[PDB]
């Protein structure tokens, strides 16, 4: 079963107005098979609107393209992003809930470091008693880690099934 198409799209902002469907394709085919590749244009002038999207055959190919940032396409550094949810923002921090009183920093680090480079791990404690409250925040150096994390259906850390959400600052 193919992964859902929505999870195989990369939305590319910041394009050069000279980038075409064809030149965007030739660039991003370096990291996988593309089933779709679109530059958005004005319906009347045909002038570029400066953004588009590509669709890879697999999620691993999306990962390969994101791991190859920064992407300079037709002379300009562009901004690729995975699909955002409706309401959500592009952030570098997550809330991790349901970790209870026995989960330590190294449990969170060993798991989440495989999504991206961690900068801060904050295990929350009670302001009055100092006891652990059962949730934590993890900050990464880049938003794609968070984008990969929050689209997973399940997160298991230290045996616990955790609730993970984007955290706004
Ligand atoms: C979801 C989503 N997440 N991001 C970052 C962009 C989208 C999106 O739906 N873009 C609209 C299409 C691009 C051609 C029209």
Swiss-Prot record:
Region named Globular B domain: 88-169
- Glycyl lysine isopeptide (Lys-Gly) (interchain with G-Cter in SUMO2) cross-link site: 2, 72, 166
Instruction: State where the protein is found.
Output: Nucleus; Cytoplasm
Describe the processing and modification events after translation.
Sumoylated.
What this protein is reported to do is described as: Involved in the packaging of pre-mRNA into hnRNP particles, transport of poly(A) mRNA from the nucleus to the cytoplasm and modulation of splice site selection. Plays a role in the splicing of pyruvate kinase PKM by binding repressively to sequences flanking PKM exon 9, inhibiting exon 9 inclusion and resulting in exon 10 inclusion and production of the PKM M2 isoform. Binds to the IRES and thereby inhibits the translation of the apoptosis protease activating factor APAF1. May bind to specific miRNA hairpins. (Microbial infection) May play a role in HCV RNA replication.
Top-rank lineage group of the source organism: Eukaryota
Q: Where is this cross-link: Glycyl lysine isopeptide (Lys-Gly) (interchain with G-Cter in SUMO)?
A: 100
Would you tell me the protein name for this molecule?
Answer: Heterogeneous nuclear ribonucleoprotein A1
Residue segments, region Globular A domain: 1-87
Q: What are the RRM domain coordinates in residue numbering?
A: 8-87, 92-169
Q: Which residues carry this modification: Phosphoserine?
A: 16
Complete-protein stretch covered: 7 to 182 of 372
Which disorder is recorded? Inclusion body myopathy with early-onset Paget disease with or without frontotemporal dementia 3: An autosomal dominant disease characterized by disabling muscle weakness clinically resembling to limb girdle muscular dystrophy, osteolytic bone lesions consistent with Paget disease, and premature frontotemporal dementia. Clinical features show incomplete penetrance. Amyotrophic lateral sclerosis 20: A neurodegenerative disorder affecting upper motor neurons in the brain and lower motor neurons in the brain stem and spinal cord, resulting in fatal paralysis. Sensory abnormalities are absent. The pathologic hallmarks of the disease include pallor of the corticospinal tract due to loss of motor neurons, presence of ubiquitin-positive inclusions within surviving motor neurons, and deposition of pathologic aggregates. The etiology of amyotrophic lateral sclerosis is likely to be multifactorial, involving both genetic and environmental factors.
Q: Which organism is it from?
A: Homo sapiens (Human)
Query: What is this organism's lineage?
Result: Eukaryota, Metazoa, Chordata, Craniata, Vertebrata
Subunit description: Identified in the spliceosome C complex. Identified in a IGF2BP1-dependent mRNP granule complex containing untranslated mRNAs. Interacts with SEPT6. Interacts with C9orf72. Interacts with KHDRBS1. Interacts with UBQLN2. Interacts with PPIA/CYPA. Interacts (via the RGG-box) with the HOXB-AS3 peptide; the interaction inhibits binding of HNRNPA1 to the intronic sequences flanking exon 9 of the PKM gene, preventing inclusion of exon 9 and promoting inclusion of exon 10 which suppresses formation of the PKM M2 isoform and promotes production of the M1 isoform. (Microbial infection) Interacts with HCV NS5B and with the 5'-UTR and 3'-UTR of HCV RNA.
